[PDB]
Amino acid sequence: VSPPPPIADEPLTVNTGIYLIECYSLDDKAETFKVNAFLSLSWKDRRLAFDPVRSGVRVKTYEPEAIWIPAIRFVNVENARDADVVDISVSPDGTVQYLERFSARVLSPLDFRRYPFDSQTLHIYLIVRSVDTRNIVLAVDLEKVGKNDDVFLTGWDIESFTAVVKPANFALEDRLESKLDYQLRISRQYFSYIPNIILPMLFILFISWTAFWSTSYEANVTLVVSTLIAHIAFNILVETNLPKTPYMTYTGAIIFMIYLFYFVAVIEVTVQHYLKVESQPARAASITRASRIAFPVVFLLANIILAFLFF
Amino acid sequence: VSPPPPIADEPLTVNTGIYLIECYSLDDKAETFKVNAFLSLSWKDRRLAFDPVRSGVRVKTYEPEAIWIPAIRFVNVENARDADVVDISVSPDGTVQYLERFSARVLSPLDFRRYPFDSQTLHIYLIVRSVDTRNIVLAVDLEKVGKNDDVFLTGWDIESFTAVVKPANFALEDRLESKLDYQLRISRQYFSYIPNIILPMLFILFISWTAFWSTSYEANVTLVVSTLIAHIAFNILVETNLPKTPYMTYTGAIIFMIYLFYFVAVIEVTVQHYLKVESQPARAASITRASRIAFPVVFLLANIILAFLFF
Amino acid sequence: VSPPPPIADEPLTVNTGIYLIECYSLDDKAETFKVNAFLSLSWKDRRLAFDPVRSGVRVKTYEPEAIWIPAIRFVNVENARDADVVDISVSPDGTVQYLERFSARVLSPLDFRRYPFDSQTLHIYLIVRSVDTRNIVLAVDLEKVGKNDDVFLTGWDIESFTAVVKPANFALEDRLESKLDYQLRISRQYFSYIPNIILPMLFILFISWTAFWSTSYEANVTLVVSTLIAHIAFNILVETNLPKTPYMTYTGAIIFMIYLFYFVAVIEVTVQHYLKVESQPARAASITRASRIAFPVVFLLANIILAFLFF
Amino acid sequence: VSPPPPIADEPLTVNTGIYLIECYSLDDKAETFKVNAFLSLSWKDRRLAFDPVRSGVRVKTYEPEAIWIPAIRFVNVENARDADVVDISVSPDGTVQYLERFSARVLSPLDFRRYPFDSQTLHIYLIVRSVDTRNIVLAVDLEKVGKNDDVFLTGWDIESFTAVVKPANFALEDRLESKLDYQLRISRQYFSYIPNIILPMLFILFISWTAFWSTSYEANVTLVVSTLIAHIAFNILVETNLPKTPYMTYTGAIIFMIYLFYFVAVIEVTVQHYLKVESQPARAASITRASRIAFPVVFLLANIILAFLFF
Amino acid sequence: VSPPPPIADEPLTVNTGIYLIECYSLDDKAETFKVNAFLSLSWKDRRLAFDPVRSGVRVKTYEPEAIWIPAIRFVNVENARDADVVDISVSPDGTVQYLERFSARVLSPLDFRRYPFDSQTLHIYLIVRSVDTRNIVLAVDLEKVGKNDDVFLTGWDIESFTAVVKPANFALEDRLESKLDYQLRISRQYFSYIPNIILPMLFILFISWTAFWSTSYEANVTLVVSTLIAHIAFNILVETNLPKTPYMTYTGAIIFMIYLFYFVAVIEVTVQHYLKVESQPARAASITRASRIAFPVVFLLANIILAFLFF
Ligand SMILES: [Cl-]
Ligand SMILES: [Cl-]
Ligand SMILES: [Cl-]
Ligand SMILES: [Cl-]
Ligand SMILES: [Cl-]
Ligand SMILES: [Cl-]
Ligand SMILES: [Cl-]
Ligand code: NA
Ligand code: NA
Ligand code: NA
Ligand code: NA
Ligand code: NA
Ligand code: NA
What we know:
Five copies of one chain form a homopentamer. Chain A is an alpha+beta fold. Chain A has two domains: 1-192, Acetylcholine Binding Protein, Chain: A (Distorted Sandwich); 193-311, Methane Monooxygenase Hydroxylase, Chain G, domain 1. Chain A contains five helices and eleven strands, in the order ββαβββββββββαααα. The first copy, chain A, has helices at 52-55, 193-208, 217-240, 250-277, 281-310; strands at residues 12-27, 32-44, 60-61, 72-74, 82-90, 95-107, 119-129, 136-140, 146-147, 156-171, 176-188. In chain A, strands 1, 2, 3, 5, 6, 8 and 9 form a seven-stranded mixed beta sheet that branches. In chain A, β5 and β6 form a beta hairpin. In chain A, α2 (193-208) runs antiparallel to α3, α3 runs antiparallel to α4 (250-277) and α4 (250-277) runs antiparallel to α5 (281-310). The longest helix of chain A has 30 residues, at 281-310. Chain A starts with 11 loop residues before the first strand and ends with a helix. At the C-D interface, β1, β2, β5, β6 and α2 of C face α3 and α4 of D. The site of one chloride ion has 2 residues of chain B, from β10. Chains A, B, C, D, E: Belongs to the ligand-gated ion channel (TC 1.A.9) family. Chains A, B, C, D, E: The chain crosses the membrane at residues 190-212, 216-240, 249-277, 281-311. Chains A, B, C, D, E: It comes from Gloeobacter violaceus (strain ATCC 29082 / PCC 7421). Chains A, B, C, D, E: Keywords: Cell inner membrane, Cell membrane, Ion channel, Ion transport, Ligand-gated ion channel, Membrane, Potassium, Potassium channel, Potassium transport, Receptor, Signal, Sodium, Sodium channel, Sodium transport, Transmembrane, Transmembrane helix, Transport. Chains A, B, C, D, E: It is a multi-pass membrane protein.
């Protein structure tokens, strides 16, 4: 079966629509998401036109094999989508209404800069390759773009699912290609990061600062070194949930900066002990008293600077 | 093959039934479960009606290809179900009895608010889309809804498997969809959480309180910081078995609250040492004696408040 | 193609056999095992009778599509088995000898009560559903039940592979169903648990008891708290190799009980320090001396009681 | 299509060959390896004989469906191999030269006794099942056994890939079976185990022996208990890379033995403290001085005994 | 269908091209990467030649089944590629233009010597096998070799994707093979290794050197042993992201060398205590003062030597 011939030299418009049934498995490390959706395609094929008065029938149903169907592919999928043709309906003028239900694993890059207070625009790119006989162009039927009310993505809030109505028409290997951009806007639910990572991380940090109200070097060494080890555990935990980025993430910056606080607390604990052993506890007392204010003040100002730079 | 034509303008009723053979892999992080079951479908097709006397047969067996079969899909499935047609039997009046055995990975959301003492209602949503020629509506044959007595779900107790007999009829892309809700009620076997997480977590916490019967700052720092690190290990362990939720879970709240107890125990240990170094051990003795009562009492009252709020 | 017709009203006997080629992946958490085996089926189909003089062949070979083959399924599989038809041989009377090689992931519940000194009876349930025309019943050809001498299951000893010769015939959705029970008896190789979990766990426990020969509170706190943390690591390790059970496992009980020993050792260490600080070391000396005997004696008696209760 | 008929009562010889293209994924825990290779089969079928000067062609190419091909299977595969028929060439005398490219996951047992200084013999067992018309026997065409020079197996050295030319002919379910043993000899690259596990493990052990040059019980307890915990971490790490064995492996024995050294170091540290508290430091000094030598000596002697027993 | 016959005895040239659409999953441990691309093939088949004037058409479209297509395979793939034929266009002279979109998991070795500052040359080896009728040779159409500008490989920078235009011609299984080398040059984004592994690792190391400004053996033991344990955690973390190599990696060498620094710091801490207990603190003071300079100087020089040897 060949493509429909043009009336004049016009390209063949394939109107498209995606209706999300299910959203699942947003993998941060992989930068992938799985989707289960309806893909709708519509185009005119005058060769299929019929008289509804004569035929008695208002609509003609077809098997995919029986007619020409545009080969629509997804640009950003891991493997080709698993599709099930739901319906193919032809109206008297030859307008074909194709509907399939598919499942696909989509590769869409994520920006982790503001993690875990980040928002993402996930993409589903539809594409058609033109033939020698005629140029095929994609379009968006907005009446056929949407999502089921029950669509949920664990650990995320779904903001909107829209399509950039204007396709990207470009040449690729001496044939036209017509690409469409379906955008699924999501924002991470940061809630659980507060009681599970952020506040536990701050508690252990504040515990290390109790060494500024202690003259016991042995206890101080234990306080600062022990809490530093728990910070390393949190750093390891955080970096397991994320891919390696050529930029600093928000949490990454805080986590990194906190190492400097532990390092300076050790220097302080060391300086205090050395002075007290050298029979200079008055000087050690001044440094320890200043530290009590300096450490929380510098921590709060540093966080204000970071929050400003990232948001 | 076209759908059965209506006698009058009535929709076609497809009676359904699901009989669970196997239940497995309830994944909490994924919020999925795997099922292996019988799907039964029944509808009247008068074009298939026959005279038992002339034919000799009192039931006719068919191959799926030979006749029209309604395209039934599951809404909440990762990938389309793996089905195997077991039987298709037609009675003289044209009533078709279709049976298939399927396996599917079902996506059903879980409420972790009362974890690990939670109960869930897992869903299997059956759907059918109408055709241009006629509207298809779903029904429940209760005689064909059930589960094998041996059906077990590791870590869970199976309470019931029932169906909401009235479908949720709605329009989707200008065609009627008829959706049925099959509900599998389960309750989590919380038993193992008691010897493996809850009691070890309480033991380490109570160990931190032995610092209220010690004047040794160095030993106290060791007691409270060491047990805090073991609590972080339990928090990490717990959060690996669960997805990130935009709400507090029962265990999550207890785990979080216990951090405040460790924090205040460190403040106490610090205050006691500072006072004793300042030659004020009488005042330190009063704070330590009060702590011995205050810590267990406040812990027990806080847990009563939490248990009340969650149950 | 219809099933073979009866000579009289007798059901159709399908003789079965399973010959294990490979056993692998016994997953404790999943309660599954993977099997690669021969499935042999035999039944009479008089419609397939032939004269070897005419046909010029004593046995006829067929493609599965060419003839009626009973639809044999496995009850307890995750997904439908991967099968490859090896041979189909028809002798002149119409006796069909079907042979397939399959691989399947079998769901079979495990009893961890005596873990890791436990034994299991793994099951492979064969089933057939009757048709309108005639009742199909399963049987066991014992000459065709067995296992390759080289069949090994990593971490287990294979005791026997037998079949319960009498099928379970029962009605399911108004049709007879014929079930067969193939039983693979295995027993766990508990060896590696001794040098990797049990003995390391006892060594750290005995190390904590050296605190009963020390008057150094700071050293004692370190001894008991440090070894308790290593016990938590072993508990976490053990529970990762097992599913969450609504009962106590043997190892689980020992692991749990050992927490009580660590808890009481902390109480002792605390009591000893409090007394020595209160200038009562004579009383502390009595408690410490008693502990030296009490702790190992109570540990040994408690283990005798547990071993008795579990075996 | 039936098998080739015999000239006399001789069995049909199927000459075989395996040429490895890729080797990957040697999974120690699973005791599996993945292979991508050429499988070559050759046999005479006189029914396919032709006159080259009358047919014009010197060699005839066929589609698998067109001719009888022996059903060759692999004994030790997880799931049936993924095969792609590359070529089928028939020479004038009726000699068929079949070539396929396959990929398979091979289940082959491993001997961890000398790990990580172990060598293995991986197996790929080829098998054919005879038919009623004639017995099929396997043979090895050595000219068609080999491996690509670039074949690498990460973490292993590939020594040789040979075939035991004599097949194992045996009856199985009243038909002859002809098995062939293809052997892939490999030896593990132990190198990385030295800087990552062995030397770090020895460093921490030698660190624990610095307690033999210290009279500080509190410091000694810290030295020995801390390093013991790091040894537990290495033991856990090692046992994650290996399956559970009903025998001791080399690393396992060393790892186990080192626990006894930590245990005795604790006894020593305890004995030294008890004596010094009892005002017997002269006796404690003798035990500590003896320990300084006895420990490394016994350690190094015990290692010689182990190396001897294992190699 | 047979291959195209030669005009004279010339081989059949199959011009090839690969256009990368997506690059993903560079697995370091597996030494694999997943690719989604266009594979273009072109060859002359005079049997397909047509007169454009009498045919009406300037080009002819074909279904793969209708014509002879060269069987092109990939050498270094795990499983055979998943392909979807996009277009087959025949020009009047019989020149066939074949286009398929494929996805494959390519096995390509990585050199981790300079890790994580390493660069790789990933390979895709295209191959075709000759037939008895004629020799098939591969060529590169450079106009059809490329990559989409949006092609990203998480954690890597893509430098170039080129082809070695001259094929490798060798005999394998008594037929000539024509192999092409497609090279994807990448360089690892080392950025995240600095804040997550390298700097944390240096901070803990420098913390252990504060023991050179302390006379407290108990505190020193804590400082050096605690930080050593955190170094073991980083070593374990690093080795989980990498396969076992028969060579030292850059990070591996640094990580290994740092163990020697911890070992010598323990010797120093021990020597200092022994001397001070023996009433020789003046000598201990000299060793501690020298260590303060020696340790950072030797660390910096050792790193200069290592950086030189590796880069
Ligand atoms: Cl697609
Ligand atoms: Cl479905
Ligand atoms: Cl509606
Ligand atoms: Cl409708
Ligand atoms: Cl099955
Ligand atoms: Cl196979
Ligand atoms: Cl391929
Ligand atoms: Na079509
Ligand atoms: Na149908
Ligand atoms: Na300590
Ligand atoms: Na059949
Ligand atoms: Na064949
Ligand atoms: Na072809």
